[PDB]
Amino acid sequence: QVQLVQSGAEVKKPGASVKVSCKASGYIFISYFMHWVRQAPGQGLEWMGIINPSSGDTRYAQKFQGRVTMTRDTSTNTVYMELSSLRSDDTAVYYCARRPERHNWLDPWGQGTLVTVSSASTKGPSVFPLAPSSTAALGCLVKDYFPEPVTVSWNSGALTSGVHTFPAVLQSSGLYSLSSVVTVPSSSLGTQTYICNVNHKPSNTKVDKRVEPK
Amino acid sequence: EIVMTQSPATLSVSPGERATLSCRASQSISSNLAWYQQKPGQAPRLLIYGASTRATGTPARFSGSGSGTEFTLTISSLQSEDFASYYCQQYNNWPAITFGQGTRLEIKRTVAAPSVFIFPPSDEQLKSGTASVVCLLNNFYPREAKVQWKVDNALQSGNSQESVTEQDSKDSTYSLSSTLTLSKADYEKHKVYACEVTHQGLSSPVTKSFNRG
């Protein structure tokens, strides 16, 4: 039914420009305005602007007047948001949202497009183990990769309970770091194989690290 | 130029009780306000509009009162799927809309003291120029926890990073990790590496430490 489908995630070097699509399905594209808002994990939602699909007329938020350009294609029924002069605080999730008179409240929203602003280059994560000495806690420091995301599964999906995978942190290098840690009965090491399988699809990386101790 | 300010930034309440958030406007927006719920990794979904009118599919425990400058969303009888983030939004003058900062709703549970662990740098990472000591705070509640690093009793400042996970699904607790990164030269120059955890579920701080070797 009512569906907005935007483009995939994108990585930008600072000062470039990014163009996010948003395809509608399940309603009359020409009859309902399209809002663009954004969400950075340092604040809440930031409205970017409003476009009328039938006309193409726009009005942008005061914060973005100039850098943002909203357009549309009636044939393929797609709205486009283009943000330019990308500074490092423009990395965020970008949402298009359909407006259902003077009733402006947005529904439904798109899947969101993650746009990262950084000059770091694609890089595989280096995996290091977190071995336990004296229940027991074992872990996996996946370190210095770009860009996000990474997938961590223990034991090729065997061990799942007690597993805690931490959100990634952006280091001063511009690369990300995250750890995954699972608690296991202490007697099980010395008997059971506990492998940390990480994969990074951006940068052709498939690493397996046996996490054993002492 | 109309600003919406969200009630408290975070709220923890036990499942099944009552939850009250309050959106505030600098300018009187008359009625003219919507609410959104958003789960992590997902887009916001519409909840109420016109301050009080539930959206299609919005269950009856969600209600909202308003008119003027100060508004309120209320969830009677919390539920598992309601713990999320909630945003208010204004449309006082037609095309211009501004959102709130947000209020994250959390599950209130019993106090749980963290199980602490410390991990030295792995002998594969020292071959480069870095060393990482990792302190884990497993399955604790509430969120508030103060971890400090000390090397040779020298209290570290601005060289660790903290990351906290989302509230566990089966236990409703949190886990936290403090990663201290040093140069290998700085690492092998010191012996005792200690991570001290302060938490309201702890009679006294829990210090977990190790020696280089």
How far apart (Å, rounded) are the C-alpha atoms in residues A13 and A109?
A: 27
CATH fold label, A3-117 = Immunoglobulin-like (2.60.40)
B105 near B9, Cβ under 8 Å?
no
| Number of Cβ within a 10 Å radius of residue A156 | 9
How far apart (Å, rounded) are the C-alpha atoms in residues B116 and A72?
A: 54
Which residues of A fall within a CB distance of 8 Å from B115?
Answer: 137, 183
Q: Characterize the bridge pairing of strands A176-184 and A136-145.
A: antiparallel
| Number of Cβ within a 10 Å radius of residue A185 | 11
How far apart (Å, rounded) are the C-alpha atoms in residues A177 and A167?
A: 9
Nearest CA-CA distance, residue A85 and chain B, Å? 23
How far apart (Å, rounded) are the C-alpha atoms in residues B141 and B175?
A: 9
Task: Provide the β-strand partners of residue A75.
Answer: none
| Number of Cβ within a 10 Å radius of residue A168 | 19
Nearest CA-CA distance, residue A75 and chain B, Å? 25
Which of B103, B85, B118 has the alpha carbon at shortest distance from A131? Answer: B118
How far apart (Å, rounded) are the C-alpha atoms in residues B180 and A91?
A: 26
Say yes or no: domain A126-210 is CATH 3.40.50.261: no
DSSP 8-state symbol, B202: -
Q: Characterize the bridge pairing of strands A3-6 and A10-12.
A: unpaired
Given phi > 0 = left and psi -120 to 50 = alpha, else beta, which region is B108?
beta
Query: CA separation (Å) from B34 to B48, B82, B204?
Result: 5, 17, 46
Q: Best of B97, B162, B209 to disrupt the A interface by mutation (most A CBs within 10 Å)? A: B97
DSSP B145-181: EEEEEEETTEE--S-EEEEEPPPPTTT--EEEEEEEE
How far apart (Å, rounded) are the C-alpha atoms in residues A189 and A193?
A: 7
DSSP A3-30: EEEE---EEE-TT--EEEEEEEESS-GG
Q: Do A107 and B46 touch (CB under 8 A)?
A: yes
Q: Do A95 and B91 touch (CB under 8 A)?
A: no
Phi, psi of B145 (to 5 degrees): -155, 130
How far apart (Å, rounded) are the C-alpha atoms in residues B186 and B172?
A: 38
Task: Provide the β-strand partners of residue B117.
Answer: B136
How far apart (Å, rounded) are the C-alpha atoms in residues A79 and A49?
A: 12
Residues B4, B10, B12, B13, Cα dihedral to 10°: 0
DSSP A21-88: EEEEESS-GGGS-EEEEEE-TTSSEEEEEEE-TTT--EEE-TTTBTTEEEEEETTTTEEEEEE-S--G
How far apart (Å, rounded) are the C-alpha atoms in residues B29 and B27?
A: 6
Chain CA centroid to CA A55, Å: 32
DSSP A96-112: EEE---------SB---
Phi, psi of A88 (to 5 degrees): -70, -15
Helix boundaries (H) for chain B: 184-188
Quoted resolution (Å): 2.5
- The two three-digit tokens of residue B80, written as one number: 């598992």
Token pair 């330019």: residue: A84
Chain CA centroid to CA A144, Å: 17
Query: CA separation (Å) from B196 to A131, A202, B132, B138, B182?
Result: 20, 37, 16, 14, 18
- Structural domain boundaries in chain B: 1-109, 110-212
Nearest CA-CA distance, residue B14 and chain A, Å? 23
CA triple B143-B156-B212, angle to 5 deg:
105
How far apart (Å, rounded) are the C-alpha atoms in residues A130 and A127?
A: 10
How far apart (Å, rounded) are the C-alpha atoms in residues B82 and B55?
A: 15
A91 near A42, Cβ under 8 Å?
no
CA triple A205-A10-A109, angle to 5 deg:
120
B73 near B84, Cβ under 8 Å?
no
- Which of A44, A62, A143 shows the shortest C-beta gap to B87? A44
- The two three-digit tokens of residue B83, written as one number: 């713990």
Chain CA centroid to CA B101, Å: 14
- Range(s) for CATH 2.60.40.10 in chain A? 3-117, 126-210
Q: Do A132 and B134 touch (CB under 8 A)?
A: no
Q: Do B99 and A44 touch (CB under 8 A)?
A: yes
How far apart (Å, rounded) are the C-alpha atoms in residues B142 and B171?
A: 12
Buried b (16+ CB within 10 A) or exposed e, B1-40: ebebebbeeebbbeeeeebebbbbbeeebeebbbbbbbee
B175 near B138, Cβ under 8 Å?
yes
B70 near B22, Cβ under 8 Å?
yes
Span between the terminal Cα atoms of chain A, in Å: 57
Chain CA centroid to CA B85, Å: 10
How far apart (Å, rounded) are the C-alpha atoms in residues B121 and B48?
A: 51
Look at chain B and count its residues.
213
Task: Provide the β-strand partners of residue A22.
Answer: A6, A79
Q: Characterize the bridge pairing of strands A34-39 and B53-54.
A: unpaired
Query: CA separation (Å) from A197 to A56, A75, A193, A205?
Result: 48, 45, 12, 11
How far apart (Å, rounded) are the C-alpha atoms in residues A174 and A201?
A: 19
CA triple B133-A184-A153, angle to 5 deg:
75
Query: CA separation (Å) from A25 to A2, A6, A22, A55, B56?
Result: 6, 11, 10, 19, 19
Look at chain A and count its residues.
214
Q: How many CA atoms lie within 13 A of B189 on its CB side?
A: 6
Phi, psi of B51 (to 5 degrees): 75, -35
Token pair 């000390």: residue: B150
Which of A105, A80, A95, A98 has the alpha carbon at shortest distance from A31? Answer: A98
How far apart (Å, rounded) are the C-alpha atoms in residues A35 and A96?
A: 6
A106 near A156, Cβ under 8 Å?
no
How far apart (Å, rounded) are the C-alpha atoms in residues A25 and A77?
A: 8
A36 burial type by CB count under 10 A (0-12 exposed, 13-18 middle, 19+ buried) = buried
Which residues of B fall within a CB distance of 8 Å from A59?
Answer: 95-96
Task: Give percent helix, percent strand, percent coil of chain B, each to the nearest 5.
Answer: 5, 50, 45
Q: Which amino acid is at A19?
A: K
Which of A120, A127, A171 has the alpha carbon at shortest distance from B162? Answer: A171
A165 near A159, Cβ under 8 Å?
no
Q: Which amino acid is at B34?
A: A
